[PDB]
Design a protein around this ligand. Sequence first.
Ligand SMILES: NC(=O)C1=CN([C@@H]2O[C@H](COP(=O)(O)OP(=O)(O)OC[C@H]3O[C@@H](n4cnc5c(N)ncnc54)[C@H](O)[C@@H]3O)[C@@H](O)[C@H]2O)C=CC1
Ligand SMILES: NC(=O)C1=CN([C@@H]2O[C@H](COP(=O)(O)OP(=O)(O)OC[C@H]3O[C@@H](n4cnc5c(N)ncnc54)[C@H](O)[C@@H]3O)[C@@H](O)[C@H]2O)C=CC1
Ligand SMILES: COc1cc([C@H](O)[C@@H](CO)Oc2ccccc2OC)ccc1O
Ligand SMILES: [Mg+2]
Lengths: 273, 273
Amino acid sequence: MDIAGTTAFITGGASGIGFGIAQRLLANGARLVLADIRQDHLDEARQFFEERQQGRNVHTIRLDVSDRAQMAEAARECEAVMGGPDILINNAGIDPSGPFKDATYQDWDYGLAINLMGPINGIMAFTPGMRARGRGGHIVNTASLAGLTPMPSFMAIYATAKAAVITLTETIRDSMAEDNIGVTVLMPGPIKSRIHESGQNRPERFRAGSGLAETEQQLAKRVVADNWMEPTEVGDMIVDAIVHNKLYVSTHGNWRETCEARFQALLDSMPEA
Amino acid sequence: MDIAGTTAFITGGASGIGFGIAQRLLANGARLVLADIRQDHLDEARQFFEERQQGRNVHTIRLDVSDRAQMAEAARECEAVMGGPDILINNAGIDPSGPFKDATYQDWDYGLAINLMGPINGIMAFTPGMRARGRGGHIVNTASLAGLTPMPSFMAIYATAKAAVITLTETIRDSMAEDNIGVTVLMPGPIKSRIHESGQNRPERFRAGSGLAETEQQLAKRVVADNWMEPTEVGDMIVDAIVHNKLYVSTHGNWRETCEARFQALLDSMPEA
Ligand SMILES: NC(=O)C1=CN([C@@H]2O[C@H](COP(=O)(O)OP(=O)(O)OC[C@H]3O[C@@H](n4cnc5c(N)ncnc54)[C@H](O)[C@@H]3O)[C@@H](O)[C@H]2O)C=CC1
Ligand SMILES: NC(=O)C1=CN([C@@H]2O[C@H](COP(=O)(O)OP(=O)(O)OC[C@H]3O[C@@H](n4cnc5c(N)ncnc54)[C@H](O)[C@@H]3O)[C@@H](O)[C@H]2O)C=CC1
Ligand SMILES: COc1cc([C@H](O)[C@@H](CO)Oc2ccccc2OC)ccc1O
Ligand SMILES: [Mg+2]
């Protein structure tokens, strides 16, 4: 679908990959709603586009994607202020990783709430309107290659949710197709971003009784490598996927062989038909 | 691991695949705790083993695997009444399928609660004791080939949860291995069972506001095909998986080519590293 003249609603749109996607959709003629739990991120993002005199084409909403009431309100606000959206980017996510034995129910609930229920809430809150307006659209869900290649127990909560997001995206494709809505699941490798600030981004209700505060502290000090990919490069991949209705977008090929070995082991478990 | 003398805790153990696993584990010397939400299933299972003069080695607990308090209770009751468990079979599941546009938040919450949080609750409630007792053990999670092969939107909630269970099992392997606990994900194709009674098995709190009551009513009328696999055949596959610590068990080969096509599409999305 053509991006010119559309409105895109982007969760986690005020940092990292979501912001990279925002820049590139804007550059291709979309107007933007950036939805984010971090007010300081939102302010920074707003100032960025204002410095380039694009502030008119950008709206910001502070919310938690795991709050269904806020998501319903945001769908109404998007339509009322910016129109649509035609393009739904369910991109917000956090890193709930840590020693597996230390993880508590609060950590599981947190990890699944943001990284799996966030995209589901986006679909449930926004796609009824996307269907009803009858001008098609597109959905991008940001999963991870960690949802595909074998991962260690330290990243169990993350990997589990991201694998579910890949399958979610695959399965909804034919339903969304009924109303000319395409879908893409984005599976990145290492991208420069601020996901190391995940501890700050954890919603209040998931903090008490967490077992992973110490890991979140260490994560906060992690240096962003200069050889990680730029968010705007990922943005261009998403422009391409939206224009050409591509189901899968992977940013890196470094886990091709590890994925192949996993896939082989799965096939090998199958008897002869 | 050696099955003789162990205790196996089996969710959904009073019907279908779980009951097939129950029979073959008992045949190989395990004692059983069958945990199930359906009292009539539990009573039938009880009579079956009583008629075969094995009742002393089978204890039944009525519970909902998505109730964490009940699962904590079950871990205490299992240990106190039958010992252990050494073998944890997170097998309970339901069919939340239906026209995708009809599904509501209640249907998502139901489907994920039972099919994804059920196994997680099992791991969280039972594996600390399994580590502590220091005699090793094994975990079997029942996913589905629907978590692997591409599925239509009618089965979105089911597929999404089952894909997650596969990845969950992969990721916990190294942690569990620290304490000589092996893990297996079971991925069945069509097995003779009573999963068509899923409407009856939906916990009360997920009933009001569901959009799929009509689908559940149709499902209840579905005839179990004679050429579907016997649960006891699946049971023997699981005996082998526990004895030999096999990560993957698939019961059918019918989706080899559709999985291959999916895997190839995933790999094709990856650039040259
Ligand atoms: N190496 C990487 O950066 C990779 C990132 N991903 C995924 O990319 C997505 C975007 O993350 P990044 O750009 O890397 O990090 P980021 O932290 O720079 O951007 C994420 C934004 O989402 C926001 N956010 C977090 N929780 C939220 C919530 N509950 N509600 C609303 N907004 C929330 C954050 O405040 C942040 O502004 C995530 O889903 C992440 O899992 C996947 C693969 C690789
Ligand atoms: N063709 C098949 O039968 C296939 C089954 N599966 C999976 O096999 C597993 C076992 O299901 P089946 O043996 O087929 O059906 P089943 O309905 O005969 O057995 C499942 C048992 O789990 C119980 N149960 C349901 N919800 C529960 C809950 N919240 N708490 C405690 N117990 C609960 C049921 O009462 C039932 O006795 C499920 O996870 C299912 O998704 C996967 C692929 C294929
Ligand atoms: C760069 O920050 C992170 C990035 C991820 C990503 O989802 C993925 C990158 O695709 O992490 C991995 C994926 C595949 C293999 C190894 C990965 O890192 C451990 C997870 C957690 C993070 O803190
Ligand atoms: Mg009780």
